[PDB]
Amino acid sequence: FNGLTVLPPLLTDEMIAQYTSALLAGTITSGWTFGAGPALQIPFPMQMAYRFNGIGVTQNVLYENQKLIANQFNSAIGKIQDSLFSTPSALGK
Amino acid sequence: QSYTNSFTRGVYYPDKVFRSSVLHLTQDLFLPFFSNVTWFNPVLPFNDGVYFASTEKSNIIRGWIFGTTLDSKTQSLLIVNNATNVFIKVCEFQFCNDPMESESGVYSSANNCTFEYVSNLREFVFKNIDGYFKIYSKHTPIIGRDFPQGFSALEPLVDLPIGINITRFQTLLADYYVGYLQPRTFLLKYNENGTITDAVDCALDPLSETKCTLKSFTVEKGIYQTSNFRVQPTESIVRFPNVTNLCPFHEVFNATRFASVYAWNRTRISNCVADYSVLYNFAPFFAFKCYGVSPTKLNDLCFTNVYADSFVIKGNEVSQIAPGQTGNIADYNYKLPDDFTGCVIAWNSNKLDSKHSGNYDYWYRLFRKSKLKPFERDISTEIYQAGNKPCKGKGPNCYFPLQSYGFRPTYGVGHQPYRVVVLSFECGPKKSTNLVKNKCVNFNFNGLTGTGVLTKSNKKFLPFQQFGRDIVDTTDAVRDPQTLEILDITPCSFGGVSVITPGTNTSNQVAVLYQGVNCTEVSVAIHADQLTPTWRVYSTGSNVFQTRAGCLIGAEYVNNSYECDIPIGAGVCASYQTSQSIIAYTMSLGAENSVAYSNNSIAIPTNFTISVTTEILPVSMTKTSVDCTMYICGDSTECSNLLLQYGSFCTQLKRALTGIAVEQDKNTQEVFAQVKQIYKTPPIKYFGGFNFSQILPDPSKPSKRSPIEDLLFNKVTFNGLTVLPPLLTDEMIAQYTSALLAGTITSGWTFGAGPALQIPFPMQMAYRFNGIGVTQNVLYENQKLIANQFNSAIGKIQDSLFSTPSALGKLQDVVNHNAQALNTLVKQLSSKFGAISSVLNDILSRLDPPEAEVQIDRLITGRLQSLQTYVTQQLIRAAEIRASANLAATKMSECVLGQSKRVDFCGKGYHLMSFPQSAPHGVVFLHVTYVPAQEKNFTTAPAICHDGKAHFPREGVFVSNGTHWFVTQRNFYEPQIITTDNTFVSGNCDVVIGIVNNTVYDP
Amino acid sequence: SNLLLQYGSFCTQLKRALTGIAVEQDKNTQEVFAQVKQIYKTPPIKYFG
Amino acid sequence: TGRLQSLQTYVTQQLIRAAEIRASANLAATKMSECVLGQSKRVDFCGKGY
Amino acid sequence: VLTKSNKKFLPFQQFGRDIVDTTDAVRDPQTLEILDITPCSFGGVSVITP
Ligand SMILES: *[C@@H]1O[C@H](CO)[C@@H](O[C@@H]2O[C@H](CO)[C@@H](O)[C@H](O)[C@H]2NC(C)=O)[C@H](O)[C@H]1NC(C)=O
Ligand SMILES: *[C@@H]1O[C@H](CO)[C@@H](O)[C@H](O)[C@H]1NC(C)=O
Ligand SMILES: *[C@@H]1O[C@H](CO)[C@@H](O)[C@H](O)[C@H]1NC(C)=O
Ligand SMILES: *[C@@H]1O[C@H](CO)[C@@H](O)[C@H](O)[C@H]1NC(C)=O
Ligand SMILES: *[C@@H]1O[C@H](CO)[C@@H](O)[C@H](O)[C@H]1NC(C)=O
Ligand SMILES: *[C@@H]1O[C@H](CO)[C@@H](O)[C@H](O)[C@H]1NC(C)=O
Ligand SMILES: *[C@@H]1O[C@H](CO)[C@@H](O)[C@H](O)[C@H]1NC(C)=O
Ligand SMILES: *[C@@H]1O[C@H](CO)[C@@H](O)[C@H](O)[C@H]1NC(C)=O
Ligand SMILES: *[C@@H]1O[C@H](CO)[C@@H](O)[C@H](O)[C@H]1NC(C)=O
Ligand SMILES: *[C@@H]1O[C@H](CO)[C@@H](O)[C@H](O)[C@H]1NC(C)=O
Structure with a gap:
């Protein structure tokens, strides 16, 4: 100019992607605890049970409908890939 | 005759302004640091001031001789000085002494010696500026003659109003060091008294430029913005179309016969290149009087009207050929306007306007009963009447109104025929040069001027378009006027340079x-x-690194990875390591x-740890009120009246500042005054092992502040x-802090939702464990230890603030920002704003009010823009601190x-x-x-299948130590044997x- | 440049404001994306229920 | 005067947009932390x- | 207000200013006495009304 x-x-964008990957991996492996100290491992169907407990839903339902919920999530995330791809105004801001 | 370096010598007092313990950045003709100094009766040229350090105790130096040639034209200055008083005679002589009573004063002459004046390590700044010869003397008689690499200011010794020309100087003899001065920028540090004890250069080192920028002699570790670098232009090229010499020149300029001199030819020079300067070599043009423009070459500008004229005149008559002149030509032939900007070119034409038998052909008008006006043609061929009787023919005083020139080859310069071209306006001189490419160069293509780098262009122009633009609306591509070729205008490289330093103290x-x-x-x-940026960091071949942020020529890149210390950019960061050097590394985002x-x-x-962390939040800002009239106008009635015409600007600024002040008051009110009643801590002071000494008020001192509060305030x-x-008041704020803390440590959190409800502190901490999914049984089971942990943690906090001086960075930044805003506001009072001065009083008692109105208006506009900028900046910072104070109130409420x-x-x-602490x-x-x-x-399992049914923990987690299965809390290991009261069942x-x-x- | 020199520290104020904005952007992304102590890798190969 | 007023307008607009984006970034940090x-x-x- | 000054003017400095470039000291050669230039008192007035 x-x-x-x-x-x-x-x-750099690579470093920001690395932060995103680290946050997501800590969220999916160690759950919510990695943000309050050392990361404590826990299986994901157990962390989801905790998260159901956190909204006044007893964990049993999760297990009682584990696979279905996964598919629901597996479906929902898929729509996201389309929703951003189809609508050009999705990233409006 | 050796060469040394002037370490820090050559600092003199620039102005008689006393200053106390300040850092003043001034630009003047200084002695650059570490410059090359000649250590030595040869002739030394006087290049715009010299630093002369004579070091002798034998008094071999007997003064100075100053001048340019010493040829009895310039005022040769003769200066002598025995020990303290200087005898100065600004004489004018051919030679000095050099072409007991060991003294010789013969010189050569004393003619026109207008002025005489009387008054070991003798250093003198000799300057000639503003008609003043300024000698600055530091006569520090050190014991010896060796050149010391030390510091000493130079006081102003003498100023003499000479107003003469000086180019050379020699030393009277009956050693020394000489250095030259250049216009530089220096940061002078006046001490308590007016003693400039230190000076920092600005053109040496990246380090001694951040010092100039920050107005400080010690910079902290970090990266500092500084001046902007640019690759300067290397050459300059001006290009014009193929020079069409085809103007009506040769037929007009080189014709054997013209018309009548009064009847000039319409030599309309339009829509061609008026390159008639080559014809200067065709004929010996003698009377070349170009009054408005004098082209030795003329090929650029296009103009509408030329009104060119052709004349045939004598030699000793050009005195009447001048703008606004009167005489025979002006009053009879053609009047030249007062603003006559053109070339009168008369050339002798004996070889082409003379003949053996007499060239009685060129008539000129001598008599006319009318006066010519500029840009007029006289057509009146009537015989001039000078007698009462009617004029018809010769005889009486009735001359033919045209006299024929008697052109002869034997006549002199004043009678030889001059053929004259008169260019009388109501092109542009420059010869086209070769085109350079791929070099940062100035260009002047067909009148379009700029700087940049010209490369080959693939852009195709339609065969009428000359320039080339973009959405930015900048000239991107130009087609060559001469060779008809297209080329883009990629600009010269530029950008910012930044200086990364580990701090002045460190290195x-x-x-x-x-x-x-x-x-x-x-x-x-x-x-x-x-x-x-003329300073060059010494390139070593390895101290140059390349990165997406730019080129870092200060350090070496290391493949190692460390946490970021001084951010460079694009991930790369720089830090000092100890051998001792600066290194650049890719930032390591923590351990993998x-x-x-x-x-x-x-x-x-x-296990666990009761950690204590500090969270510092700005809550308020300094309330500032500005009197618009007094700031803008120094109690001047005229300035007040002029300001009155600008509407309610002062009222608007006052309203904004008052709003900001009341907003600050409401900010601290909302943050600290969320408690209804001031609560008092009990006298027993025992809280189940918890200490609370550094946070509770300490009555054994004024202001009743806690020790941590005392550290924060100090x-x-x-x-x-x-x-x-x-x-x-800060005492009242401390009282709110004490009340909040006492309600927290006695009634717990209950005092924030109603009346304060007392509760033993261990019980409150047990419920606070209950609040984070840890059963209260833990606290009682580990009370003492936990208390000690807290007692330890808080103790470290007291050291953490004490040891680290950068802990309270945010509040100090707020205070420094407000101080900088006020300092800028008051410093722009000294800004002239393109006016006569920065003080209203001088302008008033220097100019009449009608003229002074313009200068006062300019100063008013400048100061009003300054005030508006300050007010807008304060409004933005007030919004930011309002957000911060809302966050602080939210934290105190939660x-x-x-x-x-x-x-x-x-x-x-x-x-x-x-725990809150006022700061x-x-x-x-x-x-x-x-x-x-x-x-x-x-090892974990989501369920437990005991009686053919799944079992899930009520609030625990199922774990196993390899053999036995327990259920435990999900935040603290407490195994428990699984029972029905401990799990709940759902399905098979x-x-x-x-x-x-x-x-x-x-x- | 000489004419602009009489307008006081306008350019200095603008440069300071812009540098403050730049360091503010860097601090913004630092606060948003760098709340994690250590870079965590995904398991070598595994699904998540 | 004209160009410096343009610069001041640009800088003030950038400051206001920077405050807006700072509020947005604070919200984003709060979301990622919550x-x-x-x-x-x-x-x-x-x-x-x- | 012109009061006795303790600022040691070296015998070439006529004026004396501060970092704000405000002349906080002057000395007339006739008196040859260094004196500071602390300004006339001012401020603002504010009306408390019920
Ligand atoms: C809480 O800790 C403080 C700081 O250690 C104790 O105060 C005094 O600290 C100094 C050392 O800084 C000791 O020499 C004193 O003996 C300490 N006590 C007194 C009575 O001055 C404080 O005593 C501790 N709290 C309680 C309740 O003992
Ligand atoms: C200033 O000059 C006075 C003269 O008496 C001296 O006492 C004082 O120490 C000097 N201060 C400094 C810092 O040079
Ligand atoms: C004008 O120039 C022509 C030749 O082009 C010449 O014959 C004529 O006499 C000239 N008249 C004057 C006034 O020069
Ligand atoms: C005209 O051209 C001839 C050569 O052909 C030259 O000698 C003469 O001086 C020129 N006269 C003018 C006025 O150009
Ligand atoms: C610098 O120019 C060279 C020219 O050959 C090129 O190879 C190199 O990639 C350029 N570097 C950058 C940072 O653009
Ligand atoms: C936990 O650590 C502390 C020291 O921080 C120690 O005193 C305590 O005994 C430890 N507890 C266990 C269960 O190891
Ligand atoms: C995980 O726990 C098992 C025992 O339950 C142990 O053998 C193994 O080393 C642990 N792995 C870690 C701590 O990475
Ligand atoms: C648990 O025990 C039942 C019989 O009591 C058996 O059918 C089932 O396979 C067992 N499950 C596992 C995982 O061993
Ligand atoms: C598991 O815990 C039980 C409970 O006391 C203990 O008897 C046993 O030795 C422990 N075994 C291992 C491998 O930790
Ligand atoms: C977890 O169980 C699934 C069930 O098919 C298996 O594919 C996967 O390998 C298991 N993960 C392990 C054993 O780490």
Whole structure:
């Protein structure tokens, strides 16, 4: 330009992706605890049981409908890939 | 005759302004640091001031001789000085003494000696500026003659109003060091008295430029923005179309016969290149009087009207050919206008306008009963009447109104025929040069001027388009006017340079990041003297690194990975390591840690830590009130009247500032005054082992502040601007802090939702464990230890603030930002704003009010823009601090007046409690949190299939130590034997995946 | 440049504001994305229920 | 004067947009510290529904 | 208000300013006495009305 300069961000996109991957891996393996100290491992069907307990739903239902819920999630995430892909105004902000 | 370096010598007092312990950055003709100094009766040229340090005790130096040639034209200055008093004679002589009573004063002459004046390590700054010869003397008689690399200011000794020309200087003899001065920028440090004890250069080193920028002599570790680099232009090229000499020149300029001199030819020079300068060589043009423009070449500008004229005149008559002149030509032939901007070119034409028998052919008008006007043609051929009787023919005083020139070859310059071209306007001089490519160069293509790099273009122009633009509306591509070729205008490389330093105290080596530039490009620019930041960091061949942020020529890249210390950009960061040097590394985003996830693998901690963390929040800002009239106008009635015409700008600014002040008051009111009644701590002071000494008020001192509050307070530190005191005094704020803390430590969180309800502190902490999914039985089971942990943690806090001086960075930043805003506001009072001066009083008693109105208006506009900018900045910062104060109020209403379940809101872990502490313009939250530790790997199963039915823990987790299956709390290892009161049943043993057979014993 | 020199520290104020904005952006992304102590890897190969 | 007023307008607009984006980034940090690093009980904060 | 000053002017400095470039000290050669220039008292007035 004419004196304007766009300074690149300190955190490169690869580093931001690495932070995202680390947060997501800690969320899916160690659950919610990694943000309050050392990451404590726990199987995902147990963390989902805890999260059902956190909304006034006893964990049994989760197990009592484990696989179905997975498919629901497996379906829901799929629609996201389409929802962002089809609508061009999804990333409006 | 050796060459040395001037270490820090050559600092003189620039102005008689006393200053006390300041850092003043001034630009003047200084002696650059570490410059090359000649150590020595040869002739030394006087290049715009010289630093002369004569070091002798034998008094060999007997003064100075100053001048340019000493040829009895210039005032040769003769200066002598024995020890303290200087005898100065500004004489004018051919020679000095050099072409007991060991003195020779013969010189050569004393003619026109207008002025005489009387008054070991003798250093003198000799300058000639503003008609003043300025000699600055430091006569420090050190014992010896060796050149000391030391510091000493130079006081102003003498100023003499000479107003003469000086180019050379020689030393009177009957050693010394000489250095030259250049216009530089220096940061002078005046001490308490007016003693400039230190000076920092600005053109040397990246380190001694951040000092100039920050107005300080000690910089802290970090990266500092500084001046912007640019690759300077290398050459300059001006290009024009194929020079069409085809103007009506040769037929007009080189015709054997013209018409009558009064009847000039319409030599209309339009729509062609008026390159008639070559014809200067065709004929010996003698009377070349170009009054408005004097082209020795003329090929660029296009103009509408030329009104060119052709004349045939004598020699000793051009005196009447001048703008606004009167005489025979002006009053009879053609009047030249007062603003006559054109070329009168008369050339002798004996070889083409003379003949043997007499060239009686060129008539000129001598008599006319009318006066010519500019840009007029006289057609009147009537015989002039000079007698009362009617004029018909010769005889009486009736001359033919045209006299024929008697052109002869024997006549002199004043009578030889001159053929004259008169260019009389109501092109552009420059010869086209060769086109350069791929070089940062100035270009002047067909009048379009700029700077940039011209390369080959693939853009196809339609055969009428000359320029080329973009959405930015900048000239991107130009087609060559001469060779008809297209080429783009890629601009010269530029950007910002930043200086990375580990701090003045740590070291002095630095790094420089030329942002957004190729290392090859910057190295090439360095090689062929192309960079504007004239200082060059010494290239070693390994101290140059390339990254997406730019070229970092200050350090070496290491393949190692460390946490970021000084952010460089694009992940790359720089840090000092000890051998001792600056290194650049890719930022390591912490240690990589893979959690060993499995189908059946859980880890429950068996221990914990009661951690305490500090959370510093700005809550308020300094309340500032500005009197618009007094700030803008120094109690001047005229300025007030002029300001009155600008509407309610002063009223608007006052309203905004008052709103900001009341907003600050409401901010501290909302943050600290959420408690109805001031609560008092009990006198017993025992809280079940918890200490609470550093946070409770300490009565054995004034202000009744806690020791941590005392550390916080001791750790943080004119012209219409007034700092209004806050409504709530710091004692009152401390009283609110004490009341909140006492209600927290006696009634717990109950005092925030109603009347305070007393409760023993261990019981309150037990319920706070209940609030984070840890049964109260833990606390009682580990009371003492936990208390000690808390007692330890808080203790470390007292050291953490004490040891680290950068802990209260945010509040100090707020205070410094307000101080900087006020300092800028008052410093722009000295800004001239394109006016005569920055003081209204001088303008008033220097100019009449009608003229002074313009200058006062300019100053008013500048100061009003300054005030508006300050007010808008304060409004933005007030909104920011309002958001921060709302956050602080939310924390005090949730972290302090209760236990918050929001993660990472009231601390880095499971929140237990929080304690507020007042701080200057802010609050500090001591967040007490539960951080589990001492993990233990375990095997888990979502269910338990005992009586053919699945069993799930009511609130626990099923774990196994290899052999026996227990259920435990999911935040603290407490195994328990599985029973019916401990699990609940749902269905049979088929849907659950990780179900495991076991026994559920009934009690 | 000389004419602009008489307008006081306008350019200095603008540069300080812009640098504050830049470091604010860096701090924004630091606060948003760097709340994790250590980089965690996914298990070598495994599903999650 | 014209160009410096343009610069001041641009800088003020950037400051206001920076305050807006700072509020947005604070909200994003709060979400990642309350919706990602834990389960939030606030209604319609981490999405429409429980 | 012109009061006795303790600022040691070296015998070449006529004026004396501060970091704000406000002349906080002057000395007339006739008196040759260094004196500070602390300004006339001012401020604001505010009306408390019920
Ligand atoms: C809580 O801790 C403080 C600080 O250790 C105790 O106060 C005194 O601390 C100094 C050392 O800084 C000791 O020499 C004193 O003996 C301590 N006590 C007294 C009475 O001055 C404080 O006593 C501790 N709390 C309680 C209730 O004992
Ligand atoms: C200033 O000059 C006085 C003269 O008496 C001296 O006492 C004082 O120490 C000096 N201060 C400094 C810092 O040079
Ligand atoms: C004008 O130029 C023509 C030749 O082009 C010449 O014959 C004529 O006499 C000239 N008249 C004057 C006034 O020069
Ligand atoms: C005309 O051209 C001839 C050569 O052909 C030259 O000698 C003469 O001086 C020129 N006169 C003018 C006025 O150009
Ligand atoms: C710098 O220019 C060279 C030219 O050959 C090129 O190879 C290199 O990639 C460029 N570097 C950058 C940072 O663009
Ligand atoms: C978990 O169980 C599934 C069931 O098919 C199996 O595929 C997977 O390998 C198991 N994971 C282990 C044993 O780590
Ligand atoms: C937990 O750690 C503390 C020291 O921090 C120690 O005193 C205590 O005994 C430990 N508890 C267990 C269960 O190991
Ligand atoms: C996981 O726990 C088992 C025992 O339950 C142990 O043998 C193994 O080493 C642990 N793995 C870890 C701590 O990574
Ligand atoms: C498991 O815990 C039980 C309960 O006391 C103990 O008797 C047994 O030795 C423990 N075994 C292992 C392998 O930890
Ligand atoms: C649990 O025991 C039942 C019989 O009591 C058996 O049918 C079932 O397969 C067992 N489950 C496992 C996982 O061993």
